[PDB]
Amino acid sequence: SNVFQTRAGCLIGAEYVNNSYECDIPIGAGICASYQQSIIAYTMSLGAENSVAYSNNSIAIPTNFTISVTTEI
Amino acid sequence: LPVSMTKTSVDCTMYICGDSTECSNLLLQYGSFCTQLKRALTGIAVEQDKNTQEVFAQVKQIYKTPPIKYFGGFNFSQILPDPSKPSKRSPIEDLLFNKVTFKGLTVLPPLLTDEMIAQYTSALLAGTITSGWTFGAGPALQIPFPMQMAYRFNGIGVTQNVLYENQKLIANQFNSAIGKIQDSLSSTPSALGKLQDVVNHNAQALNTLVKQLSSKFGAISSVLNDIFSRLDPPEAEVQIDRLITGRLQSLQTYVTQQLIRAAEIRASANLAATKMSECVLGQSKRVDFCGKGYHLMSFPQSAPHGVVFL
Amino acid sequence: NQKLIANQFNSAIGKIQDSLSSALGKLQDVVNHNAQALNTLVKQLSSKFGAISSVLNDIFSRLDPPEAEVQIDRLITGRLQSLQTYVTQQLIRAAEIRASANLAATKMSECVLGQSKRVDFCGKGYHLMSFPQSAPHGVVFLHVTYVPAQEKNFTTAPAICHDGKAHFPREGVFVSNGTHWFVTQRNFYEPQIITTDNTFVSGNCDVVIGIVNNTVYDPLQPELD
Numbered sequence: 134s135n136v137f138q139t140r141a142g143c144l145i146g147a148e149y150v151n152n153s154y155e156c157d158i159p160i161g162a163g164i165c166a167s168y169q170q171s172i173i174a175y176t177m178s179l180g181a182e183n184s185v186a187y188s189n190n191s192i193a194i195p196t197n198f199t200i201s202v203t204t205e206i
Numbered sequence: 207l208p209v210s211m212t213k214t215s216v217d218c219t220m221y222i223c224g225d226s227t228e229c230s231n232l233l234l235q236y237g238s239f240c241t242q243l244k245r246a247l248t249g250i251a252v253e254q255d256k257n258t259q260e261v262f263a264q265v266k267q268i269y270k271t272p273p274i275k276y277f278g279g280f281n282f283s284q285i286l287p288d289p290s291k292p293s294k295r296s297p298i299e300d301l302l303f304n305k306v307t308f309k310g311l312t313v314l315p316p317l318l319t320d321e322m323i324a325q326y327t328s329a330l331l332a333g334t335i336t337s338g339w340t341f342g343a344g345p346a347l348q349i350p351f352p353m354q355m356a357y358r359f360n361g362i363g364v365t366q367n368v369l370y371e372n373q374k375l376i377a378n379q380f381n382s383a384i385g386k387i388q389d390s391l392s393s394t395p396s397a398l399g400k401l402q403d404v405v406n407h408n409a410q411a412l413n414t415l416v417k418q419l420s421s422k423f424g425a426i427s428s429v430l431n432d433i434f435s436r437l438d439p440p441e442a443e444v445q446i447d448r449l450i451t452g453r454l455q456s457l458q459t460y461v462t463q464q465l466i467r468a469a470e471i472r473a474s475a476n477l478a479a480t481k482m483s484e485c486v487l488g489q490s491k492r493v494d495f496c497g498k499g500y501h502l503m504s505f506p507q508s509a510p511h512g513v514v515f516l
Numbered sequence: 517n518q519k520l521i522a523n524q525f526n527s528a529i530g531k532i533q534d535s536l537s538s539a540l541g542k543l544q545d546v547v548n549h550n551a552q553a554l555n556t557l558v559k560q561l562s563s564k565f566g567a568i569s570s571v572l573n574d575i576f577s578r579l580d581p582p583e584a585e586v587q588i589d590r591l592i593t594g595r596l597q598s599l600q601t602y603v604t605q606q607l608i609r610a611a612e613i614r615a616s617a618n619l620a621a622t623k624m625s626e627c628v629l630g631q632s633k634r635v636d637f638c639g640k641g642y643h644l645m646s647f648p649q650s651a652p653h654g655v656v657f658l659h660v661t662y663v664p665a666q667e668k669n670f671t672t673a674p675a676i677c678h679d680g681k682a683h684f685p686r687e688g689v690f691v692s693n694g695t696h697w698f699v700t701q702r703n704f705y706e707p708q709i710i711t712t713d714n715t716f717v718s719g720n721c722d723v724v725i726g727i728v729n730n731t732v733y734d735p736l737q738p739e740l741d
Binding site (some may be wrong): 152184186189190191192193195196197198199200201202203204206 | 521524525529531532535536537540542543589610639640641644650651654655656657658661662663664665666667668669670671672673689691700702703704705726735
């Protein structure tokens with residue numbers, strides 16, 4: 134009863150949402166799907182917009198550090 | 207450099223038999239080959255979306271360039287995105303895109319649209335123009351660009367004095383060299399070549415598979431329906447056995463060659479994620495890794511199935 | 517600031533046990549990839565391969581032996597293809613691990629045995645050290661990295677002009693807390709006064725755009741005073 138067409142094909146069982154969130158199940162062609170409660174398909178959000186404040190005379194200097202022990206397997 | 211290749215899927219039954227249920231019944235007696243072939247092509251296909259996410263999804267946040275774009279006199283119009291064009295592809299990026307421009311062989315779509323692969327490049331190229339190398343080592347910290355360049359001169363052994371003092375000349379030399387870049391590719395020498403070889407390699411690969419569907423492989427005919435109808439049931443299966451085996455081998459050779467080719471692309475997508483970190487997000491002291499000379503900076507641009515770094 | 521750095525390293529090392537225990541998929545992928553391949557080879561032994569039956573014994577028993585050979589060849593050829601595909605995919609898989617052994621030899625040499633200046637080769641951050649831990653068919657490296665944090669905004673000027681000679685900063689940036697000009701180390705804020713010791717004087721104050729006038733202190737003259 135929910136039918137929606139995407140470049141990959143016809144997705145039946147999922148309702149397209151106009152909200153944007155990160156990619157949980159990657160459907161294909163820029164559309165990602167997760168479980169809201171129903172199964173919702175949406176357009177993936179590459180990330181959160183930040184505008185660095187470029188200016189002719191302004192600099193930002195880091196005033197503290199963090200020591201992060203990441204792991205690579 | 208070539209980052210990714212076409213993600214393709216093949217239906218073993220349509221290719222090996224195709225509108226012939228009697229063939230499908232015979233195929234099962236052969237085994238789990240279809241399952242391994244789909245597993246192989248599915249792994250190549252998911253990798254092709256991590257090859258394109260390792261190379262360009264480095265930046266966590268989609269950074270944005272300012273509305274006013276005066277950056278010390280260096281002119282980035284040719285590189286930074288303009289809204290009128292397809293997607294918002296920048297002028298050099300537009301040229302690269304225009305330059306480069308069945309029988310069960312499906313061609314899946316890439317997960318990240320070129321509108322996104324291109325928006326990732328705008329973030330990578332808009333915090334390398336404001337913050338500097340800082341974006342890739344932590345929180346992006348703004349530095350005026352005619353000053354980021356002096357820090358990048360200090361890393362080639364030349365003092366800051368040699369930039370501010372000769373700033374306008376250095377800027378005109380950068381703007382003009384940036385201008386000739388479009389003509390160097392657009393003078394039509396086969397510059398893109400490396401990316402276009404990948405398309406040609408893939409299209410020829412499918413053409414051999416489709417054109418092997420027309421091969422007897424030592425059986426009476428290439429048409430299953432004629433053989434099925436024109437031969438008695440025991441006779442038909444023995445001759446049909448050659449057709450299915452040959453087609454299974456032709457599909458098997460496509461996957462073996464495709465895994466060897468995917469390795470070459472994974473090698474070029476791991477060299478472009480060492481060049482989008484060391485060169486796009488830092489200055490490289492390695493020699494000839496990033497240009498003949500002392501690297502001052504590098505700028506990412508997205509082309510069909512690969513990346514161009516200037 | 518030694519104690520803070522020591523606890524930050526110490527707590528961060530604590531979280532790794534839980535986070536690793538929330539991870540090792542890359543290592544378990546190899547164990548799985550190998551198992552599937554061995555069973556596909558065993559199951560292909562249980563496949564007819566266009567022959568009356570998989571069991572060789574039954575084929576010999578229920579067929580005349582001179583005539584049975586062509587049917588036997590069908591099984592042997594199929595199994596030789598099955599083994600040849602095993603070896604070929606295993607040769608392609610070996611060169612994926614040889615590529616990973618080569619990056620692990622490189623990460624051991626350039627991160628455990630020294631400090632890399634390459635960007636994002638040894639952690640996201642500026643590398644401080646790295647520690648090797650064995651894992652079942654691979655290595656897990658606990659890359660330690662210094663991550664700049666807590667930014668602050670200031671006004672920057674490219675050169676400082678005193679006595680009409682431009683003065684450029686020897687190592688650092690020139691930064692202003694709104695009213696007082698200072699020379700700071702770039703990756704950590706440490707405001708310091710401007711004296712000829714931290715400044716290199718090259719050129720005259722008419723060639724660089726953004727030079728800001730101020731006083732570059734003289735250390736020798738006050739002791740003379």
